[PDB]
């Protein structure tokens, strides 16, 4: 019994276990179950685990990274199916309120972060002067120091990438209305959400369809479950550009 014949039976057994749809079982349940089985097989203190608690620990809206497929089909192909699993697009992209939450650490410099914002802004925005429903992405960054966070925002404004954060002047309170109009503003390229308290306020001010695309490495943030979520582990910030 080789690896290729064991591939389709492990996919098929998890399909009717959760009674889910087609492409969830390929990457959202199988790759999640492969890590937690390996996380307890390599554990030298506990190996005998009942499968009753294995079901609930797997069924979370989280897509974790595993080293073994990244070595198998490589970085050109592992990120390729990650684009077609949860980042599917059509020709006509509807003007939805798309929220992009990316993990910023001190190990990743500004330069590997900046073109990811350029990748998100170019692919998920239509600031054409001819359209009537313009849309711009929402950007969230977390896990970084405020000095490094303001350092990134300063250099974005110097190369003509105009954004808003709900702070139109120095000393302003957080007004989410300027975030709302910047979504429909053609001169505002994207929206920069500063904090979590900044984040939780602007869902309540949005009546249109909302979407969250989380791309993180270590720590996840508890986004409310009734929004559509895409939570994806990556190794470093360089992979996030190739998925969006």
């Amino acid at each position: 019994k080789s690896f290729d014949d064991q591939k389709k039976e492990t996919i098929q057994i998890i399909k009717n276990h959760f009674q889910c749809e087609d492409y969830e079982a390929e990457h959202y349940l199988y790759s999640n179950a492969f890590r937690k089985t390996y996380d307890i097989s390599c554990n030298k203190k506990d190996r005998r685990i009942k499968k009753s608690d294995f079901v609930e620990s797997i069924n979370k809206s989280k897509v974790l990274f595993n080293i073994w497929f990244y070595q198998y089909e490589g970085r050109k192909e592992y990120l390729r199916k990650l684009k077609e699993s949860f980042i599917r697009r059509s020709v006509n992209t509807s003007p939805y309120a798309r929220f992009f939450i990316l993990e910023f650490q001190d190990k990743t410099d500004i330069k590997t972060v900046k073109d990811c914002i350029y990748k998100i802004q170019s692919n998920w925005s239509n600031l054409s002067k001819r359209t009537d429903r313009p849309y711009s992405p929402f950007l969230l960054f977390h896990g970084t120091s405020d000095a490094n966070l303001y350092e990134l925002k300063n250099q974005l404004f110097n190369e003509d990438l105009i954004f808003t954060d709900g702070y139109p002047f120095k000393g302003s309170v957080f007004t989410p209305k300027m975030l709302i109009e910047g979504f429909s503003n053609k001169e505002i390229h994207f929206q920069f959400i500063n904090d979590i308290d900044d984040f939780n306020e602007t869902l309540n001010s949005i009546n249109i369809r909302k979407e969250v695309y989380q791309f993180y490495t270590e720590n996840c943030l508890d986004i409310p479950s009734q929004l559509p979520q895409v939570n994806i582990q990556v190794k470093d910030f360089a992979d996030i550009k190739e998925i969006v």
């Binding site: 697009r89 020709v91 239509n126």
Partner: protein, 160 residues
């Protein structure tokens, strides 16, 4: 950027495209000619492809350079895989770029199997992409090679 073009009106089998900036003049010379390929989308994974059928470049006293491109959709590209069919509709406006070499390669390298590929020519507007034909359907369905005198019809005949 180098080119700033977008679709201003669509038809069942035709798109009107207006070029707004056209900063680099070398894009218009080879990549905006009649019969060339344009990428019509707002993202970089799913797009329409279009043959340029006609264009009209009007200039005047004070108003801007009126560059209009008439294009017809030939199919769909999804993650580097080309699908034939003009049934897909692009809602305007859609950002228009000349197609990169990988899409044009994927036009002819997808509908024909790798063992069925019979290459004897390359595309006129883009030399770097070779055009293979389905050598099965090339010879069963008979070949009618047509040209004027001195056009190269016999040189084409012998090269096949």
């Amino acid at each position: 950027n180098d080119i700033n073009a977008e679709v201003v009106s669509v038809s069942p089998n035709k798109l009107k495209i207006s070029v707004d900036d056209l900063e680099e003049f070398k894009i218009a010379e080879e990549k905006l000619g009649v019969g060339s390929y344009l990428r019509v989308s707002d993202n970089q994974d799913v797009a329409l492809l279009a043959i340029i059928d006609n264009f009209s470049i009007e200039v005047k006293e004070s108003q801007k350079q009126k560059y209009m491109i008439e294009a017809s959709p030939i199919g769909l590209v999804k993650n580097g895989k080309f699908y034939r069919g003009g049934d897909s509709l692009a809602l305007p406006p859609k950002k228009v770029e000349p197609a990169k070499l990988d899409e044009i390669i994927s036009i002819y390298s997808d509908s024909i199997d790798i063992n069925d590929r019979f290459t004897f020519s390359s595309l006129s507007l883009n030399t770097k992409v070779s055009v293979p034909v389905n050598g099965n359907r090339f010879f069963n369905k008979h070949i009618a090679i047509v040209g004027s005198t001195g056009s190269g019809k016999s040189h084409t005949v012998a090269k096949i």
